[PDB]
Amino acid sequence: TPITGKVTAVIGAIVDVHFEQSELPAILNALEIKTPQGKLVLEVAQHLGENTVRTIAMDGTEGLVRGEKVLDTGGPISVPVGRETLGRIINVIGEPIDERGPIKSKLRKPIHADPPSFAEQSTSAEILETGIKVVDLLAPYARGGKIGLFGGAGVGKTVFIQELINNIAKAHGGFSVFTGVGERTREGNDLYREMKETGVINLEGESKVALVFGQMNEPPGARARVALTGLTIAEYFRDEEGQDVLLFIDNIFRFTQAGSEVSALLGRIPSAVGYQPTLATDMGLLQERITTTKKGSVTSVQAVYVPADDLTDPAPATTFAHLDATTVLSRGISELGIYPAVDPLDSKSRLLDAAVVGQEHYDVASKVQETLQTYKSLQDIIAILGMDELSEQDKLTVERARKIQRFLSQPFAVAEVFTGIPGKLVRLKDTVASFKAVLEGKYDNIPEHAFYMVGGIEDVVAKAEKLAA
Amino acid sequence: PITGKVTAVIGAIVDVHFEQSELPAILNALEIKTPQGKLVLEVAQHLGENTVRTIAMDGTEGLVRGEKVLDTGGPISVPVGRETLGRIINVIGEPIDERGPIKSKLRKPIHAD
Amino acid sequence: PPPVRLFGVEGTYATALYQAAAKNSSIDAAFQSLQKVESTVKKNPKLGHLLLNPALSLKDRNSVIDAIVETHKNLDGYVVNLLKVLSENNRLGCFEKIASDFGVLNDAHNGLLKGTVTSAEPLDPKSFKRIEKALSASKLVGQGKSLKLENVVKPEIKGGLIVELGDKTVDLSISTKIQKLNKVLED
Amino acid sequence: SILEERIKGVSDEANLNETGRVLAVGDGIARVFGLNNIQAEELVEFSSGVKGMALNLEPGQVGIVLFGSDRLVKEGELVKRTGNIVDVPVG
């Protein structure tokens, strides 16, 4: 019989219901309170016993009269999946927020699901080329991988990702998922338009991308379970459709951040820097349900909005644990004007190895690291004294590194609008050559200004002629 | 006037329990007759059950839980006038210059919008 | 000494009432009168439900108490002191809580136990009787300690039965046996 | 009963649907007894010409946030529902 209840409390967006009948609730069930603003979906998150649940409420909790009828819909929120997810942008519940009308579905799947087993795991490392020189050179990505970005406060966190979407996902044929947790709505509309324009979303045709978009406006609780919703869509492609997927998540800081908001209200004594004491488990669940298994290879891309630009904060720290590549981008390198702003001594991949990208690539990388590490080391001396007071041998290294630093800035195609500089996509094969030459000092004989914001080595040469004029 | 018996003296935070339904408002000034002289307590909370939480403006040493409190009825009312010119006055608005009881025109509440 | 501590809060109130009236050796009378005052509290429905929640003075609360002991003469003297305590603590909300707890303590003094034979279906009377008998035959029921046997219907344990009483259970439901069967065949 | 009659006599007899009477108060947030009917994030008007927004709807009490100075509010003032979620004139 109807598991009716009344709303005993509405303490923030952590409503508590008191079920009347002794028919039990169950943890991670979903409840529908019908409101004249349409239904409100709540999710049972604690049992306080004596038939009083305490429920996270996805959407806003304004208006609720203490003692409001409930009905228990049972089990976690069920998304709708199908090929029809592709070419639709969906609310957390699954309703089209792009208002493309009823999404025909075959299977409606629970938001929560268990991480696939250790046995099911499968590991591979097929070098994905991004056509971004710095990425390829320092820490190339690879298929099925979990890619990581640790971009600063509005460093065009989205912009970096957009370039990646433009390159990699149009070079990927299989399904792809875009999930944007708490992103600025206007940018999302731009993205939606751009995707439609570039046909990735073709509304007339089929789309090889599906999208879940969560506005930064949306109440914290909704943002908390935006991830789980997207994660289900990805699983449907991975599993049921079988096809190799792709996944983009931006920002997974919002996943943590949202969690920190609810936890206190939920009734938890919070850990340092206010972070939720359930940070490890929650992060763990999210990141182990994203994995390359026998079922399918899901290359995933995760973006961390470093809070206050401190990467030692616990939320960035637990992200570092669950990635196969990271490419930390920091405000300082951005201030220096280098776009992209990837730190070159704070990038790593397990996909950088001499048995992966070959001995020559690895050797090239060794020298790049060494030169830059020296260059950073002499920053003190450079400031305290003059640069001429540097030792002559070192001064060559410094001059080379100064060139390397400038060289690494490559115009991007989505940035091409904003910067005004036409984008440059440089082949991976071209990149190894380009840096190799610089390491052999071949083209070290022309200005730093020439190296600044240009593509391949050949482009530098041409730009030298341009500069010479 | 309202009177109440002291029901706590944890630090200089003195809780006074006042007659039923009749309790001073927030920011009122209370005077506890003391062997010291007077003690001025200022109501900064109502803790329910016609009890308040007050802060003290004078030392609270030797209080006995039960001592009578008297309610002035509002924020400390301090003398004002050209009389008050050149007179040292302590927090309770009384001469400490010892140039005698300051002849006053008007007295006025200390909290003023 | 206490008849085994019940809870920490509210049942400390009950414990105190109990041990004090146990030493007065007038527990049945106390309990009965408490039931009677509880009944007339409940049978005052407006402001005997709607004045169990504080909203009025200590002095006004005391006068509510005075009306309550006006409602019937006799209420022991220990439960008249218990009313004083509750008026002073300004908590009549946990008055019926204390009543229930005092009931638990009282029926502990009686030794009257309560049990349950949860099932997912209404059970035969022959089963009720046979199990009550069985439980009395065993040392599970102390003898001097009585027993109630309550079947409740809970679909939760799909079919079967579970006999429960004390901290001793035997669970031969179908759902649980299935759980182990399934589990062992998940290997 | 005569007792019950006397109980009605000593009671204020407000059923406190759509009105409450404030309990302990100070620190610019108030805890009110009653307000049985009360929308969440509603605007309530206290009897002292100051209005507040209900934040915490808790069993038995509602925790208003006082949009205004402490000096205005005293314990046991009568809180009436404005009846509307916090709205501001626009035009």
A183: annotated active-site residue: yes
Quick one: closest CA in B to D28, which residue? B45
- Residue of B16, B17, B46, B54 to mutate, testing the D interface (most D Cβ within 10 Å of its Cβ): B46
Residue A155 known to bind ligand: yes
The answer to whether the Cβ–Cβ distance between C46 and D21 falls below 8 Å is no
Is residue A59 domain-shared with residue A96, that is, in the same domain? no
| CA A269 to the chain's CA centroid | 29
Instruction: Find, among B56, B33, B61, the residue nearest to B44 by Cα.
Output: B56
Residues in chain D within 8 Å Cβ distance of A9: 56-59
Q: Any CB–CB contact under 8 A between D66 and chain B? A: no
Give the dihedral of Cα atoms A127, A131, A132, A137; nearest 10 deg: 40
D6 at interface of B, judged by CB pairs closer than 8 A: no
Total domains present in chain A:
3
Torsion angle of the four alpha carbons A361, A363, A367, A368, in this order, in degrees rounded to the nearest 10: 20
Which residues span the domain enclosing A31? 1-76
DSSP SS3 for D48 = coil
Is position A151 annotated in a ligand binding site? yes
Residue position matching structure tokens 């204390």: C98
Query: Chain C: nearest CA to B55, how far in angstroms?
Result: 25
How many Cβ contacts (< 8 angstroms) between chains B and C? 9
Whether residues A62 and A119 fall in one domain: no
- Which residues of chain C does B51 touch, with a Cβ-Cβ cutoff of 8 Å? none
Contacts of D35 in chain C (CB under 8 A): none
A389: buried, middle or exposed (CB in 10 Å: 19+, 13-18, 0-12)?
Answer: exposed
Under DSSP, is residue B55 helix (H, G, I), strand (E, B) or coil? Answer: strand
The CA distance from C161 to A363, in Å, is 72
Q: Which long-range contacts (CB under 8 A, 24 or more apart) does B5-11 make?
A: B5/B65, B5/B66, B5/B67, B5/B68, B5/B69, B6/B32, B6/B63, B6/B64, B6/B65, B6/B66, B6/B67, B6/B69, B7/B51, B7/B65, B7/B66, B8/B65, B9/B60, B9/B63, B9/B65, B11/B60
What are the residues whose beta carbons fall under 8 Å from the beta carbon of A99, sequence distance 6 or more?
none
- Same structural domain for residues A252 and A195? yes
The alpha carbon of residue A97 and the mean position of all alpha carbons in its chain are separated, in whole angstroms, by 21
Residue B20 sits in a domain of what CATH number? 2.40.10.170
* Residues A268 and A236 placed together within one structural domain of the fold: yes
Chain B hits for D71, CB-CB cut-off 8 Å, are 25-27, 111
Q: What are the angstrom distances between the C-alpha of A387 and each of A379, A381, A450, C84? A: 10, 8, 21, 88
Is A317 flagged in the annotation as binding? no
Q: Under an 8 A CB cutoff, do B49 and C58 touch?
A: yes
CA-based nearest residue to A85, from A291, A243, A256: A243
A52 and A96 both lie in a single domain: no
d(CA C29, CA B61): 51
Is B50 in Cβ contact with C59 (below 8 Å)? Answer: no
Return phi, psi of residue A368, to 5°: -65, -40
As a whole number of Å, the CA-based R_g of chain B is: 15
Contacts of A266 (CB under 8 A, 6+ apart): A14, A45, A46, A54, A56
Q: Which residue has the tokens 């009659």?
A: D5
Which of A61, A76, A91 lies at the terminal end of a domain, its last residue? A76
CB pairs under 8 A between C and D: 41
Query: What's the helix, strand, coil split of chain A in %, to 5?
Result: 35, 20, 45
CATH of domain D12-84: 2.40.30.20
Residue A74 assigned to a binding site: no
Q: What is the DSSP string of A419-467?
A: H-SPP----HHHHHHHHHHHHTTSSTTS-HHHHTT--SHHHHHHHHHHH
Nearest Cα residue to C132 out of C151, C106, C111: C151
- Amino acid identity of C167? D
Q: Are D37 and D18 in contact (CB under 8 A)?
A: yes
**Which one of D1, D2, D5, D7 makes the best mutation probe of the C interface by having the most chain C beta carbons within 10 Å?**
D7
A152 in a labelled binding site: yes
Residue A144 sits in the same domain as residue A169: yes
Long-range contacts of C66-69 (CB under 8 A, 24+ apart): C67/D3, C67/D6, C67/D7, C67/D10, C68/C37, C68/C40, C68/C41, C68/D3
- What pairs with residue D30 in β-bridges? D25, D64
B42: Cα separation from own chain's centroid: 5
Domain containing C67 — which CATH number?
1.10.520.20
Residue A184 catalytic?
yes
Determine which one of A68, A183, A218, A261 is catalytic.
A183
Catalytic residue among A54, A133, A157, A223: A157
Catalytic residue among A143, A170, A184, A331: A184
Hey, is the C-beta of A7 within 8 angstroms of any chain D C-beta?
Answer: yes
For B97, the token pair is 């210059």
d(CA C160, CA A348): 59
Q: Do A204 and A141 sit in the same domain of this protein? A: yes
